[PDB]
């Protein structure tokens, strides 16, 4: 994996963020919201 296009360091950390951090956060928030009050 590499990239002659500019700012090739951006996908480096942006692919894990879109694939791991963002989904985990959204799924956790939606899970807490689904199971709220009781």
């Amino acid at each position: 994996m590499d990239g002659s296009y500019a700012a090739s360091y951006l996908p480096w950390i942006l692919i894990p963020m879109v694939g791991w951090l963002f989904p985990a956060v959204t799924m956790g928030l939606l899970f807490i919201h689904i199971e709220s009050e009781g």
Binding site: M1, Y5, H33, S36, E37
Partner: protein, 731 residues
């Protein structure tokens, strides 16, 4: 007690099972059933939702533009469009190995990349965009456009700017502003863009934001438009030797009408396109002055509809203004039917009469475009009929529409359904019989007894447009005909493009095209029969004379009265989806096989083997798969690895849909009960307990999920086959 989600349905919020989750996702957009919904709040929420959707479309377009600019080879693609393949964007996947990296460093890229297949490169080029910075500024501006529409949607939900119900129900003014302003002014602005930018850039004249005020697109200004001598603008059109992007063969014309195809790019002339847009702009602005608003002068839709009474019909179209204006499912069904028809129309007109430069040579992109838009049209048609049935279930008023066209359509629904049944049985019986006869005839080593029947009517129609291959000499195929000697500037180019067997305009048809058009007729007739029978019985039948009391979508009515599985109109939609997918499969199979033959010059294969179905089984499906299924093998990986993997992915998803479709709930609820027993009695896991009681998917949910997997698999596997075959063969 209450579990909060979903806030819009206490009947769901008090569900202590996992269904509460699923249904919460399934009924969120059905605003009409939200607790305490009012019509005015319904309309206002729909308005804001529309704003959000427009912002989403603008963001997706900005993504296309930005990724093409950033990770594409647009400027390199312009240097040699016929050889350089356009790239959509770069790949960045840590799962990749050396083989995959080497395979996907393609089209002269220094890194793994996917090649574009949507013809957006040809679009942007024919439009006049020539650098990366232009695409970039376009993406940023579209970001701003999405921002504007998002703020508008936020503002229209505030008590200080909430449009009222009477404003939403103003049909006359809305039709005026859409016909005249939304449609007409926009085609006017697109004509102006083509005149100022697209055509000058096609001739090598750079027109940007830094010079468009200084350089007029015509040697004469607006006085020839002001005075009336409009032929000045036809001047010297682009010669038949104009090379695109240069000044060779270039002229000064900004509005022509020579018809035919550009000899190099093989697309419509940009001058004729801008001329078309100008004429259509004038027509739409004229249309947008029909209905009165606040100046007394004009028409009212209600009086026009009321006036159209009659003898045999009865009430005619009386009160239909209120009928359509008070039901949003009626408006949505009308819109969906119209938009699906015209989306199929776009699909039929883009492969035959292309309008983007050099896109006729890019065969994969054209195949993918035709397939995509025909699938969109099929979805839109199914949705239109679903919303018609939903209108019948929720909004239909029998007293305000008594004896009118609607009530009569319902009053003889048995005749309509039975005659659709007859035409469908007719078509299917005889087309399948002819195909099986041809198969059995070719099989026994006697291919001479095939029933080949010439598509005479459609060949005659082609000839009426100037097609002289079949020797019909009728209308525009006959030079001695009145219609052919009128002095229309579009006749020479049209005849030259329709009588040169080198493009995709009015393709020569044999008996196989006849058979497959009858198959298409069967598909349409049967899908429409499903949808119409569902919409007309949606209010009731002889099994459920009160089916309207249960709603548009319900599981059933039980095993009693003989059994009532798939009774609701929603079940008719779900049934019709299968036949719609089959109809689009027949469409795309026909299109792709005939076009592969056309592109390879070996039309003999399709013309001689499309008559028996084994021809389709071995010469189309089996053959064109050979490349795809070798995208990866025991020997390595080529550029079709993703397409082969996605082919198998679609197969898997399709079969998984079969899973939900064949096996029905109760078995699964019992199985889940045993698994619940297991969990409650296994130590350590007893530390943990579910918040929602696990339950099997519901009946309607199971139909929806099986159909969702079926459709996902259908689309993905056929897209993989289309792309891989047409790209490994290069047409």
């Amino acid at each position: 007690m209450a579990t909060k989600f979903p806030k819009f349905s206490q009947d769901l919020a008090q569900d202590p099972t996992t269904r509460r989750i699923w249904y919460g996702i399934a009924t969120a957009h059905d605003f009409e059933t939200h607790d305490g919904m009012t019509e005015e709040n319904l309309y206002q929420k729909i308005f804001a939702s529309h704003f959000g959707h427009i912002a989403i479309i603008f963001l997706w377009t900005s993504g296309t533009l930005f990724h093409v600019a950033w990770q594409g080879n647009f400027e390199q693609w312009i240097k040699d469009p016929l050889n350089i393949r356009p790239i959509a964007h770069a790949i960045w996947d840590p799962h990749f190995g050396e083989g995959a990296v080497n395979a996907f460093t393609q089209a002269g890229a220094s890194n793994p990349v996917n090649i574009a297949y949507s013809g957006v490169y040809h679009w942007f080029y024919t439009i006049g965009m020539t650098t990366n910075q232009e695409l970039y500024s376009g993406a940023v501006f579209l970001l701003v456009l999405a921002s504007l529409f998002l703020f508008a949607g936020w503002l229209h939900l505030q008590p200080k700017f909430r449009p009222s119900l009477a404003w939403f129900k103003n049909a006359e003014s809305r039709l005026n502003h859409h016909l005249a302003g939304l449609f007409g002014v926009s085609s006017l602005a697109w004509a102006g863009h083509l005149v100022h930018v697209a055509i000058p850039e096609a001739r090598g004249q750079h027109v940007g934001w830094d010079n468009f005020l200084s350089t007029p697109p015509h040697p004469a200004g607006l006085m020839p438009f002001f005075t009336g001598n409009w032929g000045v603008y036809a001047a010297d059109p682009d010669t038949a030797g104009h090379i695109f992007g240069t000044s060779e063969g270039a002229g000064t014309a900004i509005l022509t009408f020579l018809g035919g195809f550009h000899p190099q790019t093989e697309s419509l002339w940009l001058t004729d396109i801008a001329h078309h847009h100008l004429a259509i702009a004038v027509i739409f602005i004229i249309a947008g002055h029909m209905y009165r608003t606040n100046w007394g002068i004009g028409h009212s839709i209600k009086e026009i509809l009321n006036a159209h009474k009659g003898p045999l019909t009865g009430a005619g179209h009386t009160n239909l203004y209120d009928t359509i204006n008070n039901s949003l499912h009626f408006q949505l069904g009308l819109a969906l039917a119209s938009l699906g028809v015209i989306t199929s129309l776009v699909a039929q007109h883009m492969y035959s009469l292309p309008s983007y430069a050099f896109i006729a040579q890019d065969h994969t992109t054209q195949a993918a475009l035709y397939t995509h838009h025909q699938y969109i049209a099929g979805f839109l048609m199914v949705g239109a009929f679903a919303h018609g049935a939903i209108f019948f279930v929720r909004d239909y008023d029998p007293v305000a529409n008594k004896d009118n066209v609607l009530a009569r359509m319902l009053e003889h629904k048995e005749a309509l359904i039975s005659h659709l049944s007859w035409v469908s049985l007719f078509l299917g019986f005889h087309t399948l019989g002819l195909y099986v006869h041809n198969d059995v005839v070719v099989a026994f080593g006697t291919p001479e007894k095939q029933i080949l029947i010439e598509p005479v009517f459609a060949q005659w129609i082609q000839a009426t447009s100037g097609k002289a291959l079949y020797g019909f000499d009728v209308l525009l195929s006959n030079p001695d005909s009145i219609a052919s000697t009128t002095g229309a500037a579009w006749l020479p180019g049209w005849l030259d493009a329709i009588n040169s067997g080198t493009n995709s305009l009015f393709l020569t048809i044999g008996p196989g095209d006849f058979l497959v058009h009858h198959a298409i007729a069967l598909g349409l007739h049967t899908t429409a029969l499903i949808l119409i029978k569902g919409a007309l019985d949606a209010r009731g039948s002889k099994l459920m004379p009160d089916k309207k009391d249960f709603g548009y979508s319900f599981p059933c009515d039980g095993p009693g009265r003989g059994g009532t599985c798939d009774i609701s109109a929603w079940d008719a939609f779900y049934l019709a989806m299968f036949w719609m997918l089959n109809t689009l499969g027949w469409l795309t199979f026909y299109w792709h096989w005939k076009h592969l033959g056309v592109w390879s010059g070996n039309v003999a294969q399709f013309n001689e083997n499309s008559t028996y179905l084994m021809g389709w089984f071995r010469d189309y499906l089996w053959a064109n798969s050979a490349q795809l299924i070798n995208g990866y093998n025991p020997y390595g990986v080529n550029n079709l690895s993703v397409w082969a993997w996605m082919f198998l992915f679609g197969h898997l998803v399709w079969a998984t849909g079969f899973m939900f479709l064949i096996s029905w709930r109760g078995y699964w609820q019992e199985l889940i009960e045993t698994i619940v027993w297991a969990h409650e009695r296994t130590p350590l896991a007893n530390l943990v307990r579910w918040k929602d009681k696990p339950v099997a998917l519901s009946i309607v949910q199971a139909r929806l999920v099986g159909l969702a997997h079926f459709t996902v698999g259908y689309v993905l596997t056929y897209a993989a086959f289309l792309i891989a075959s047409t790209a490994g063969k290069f047409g």
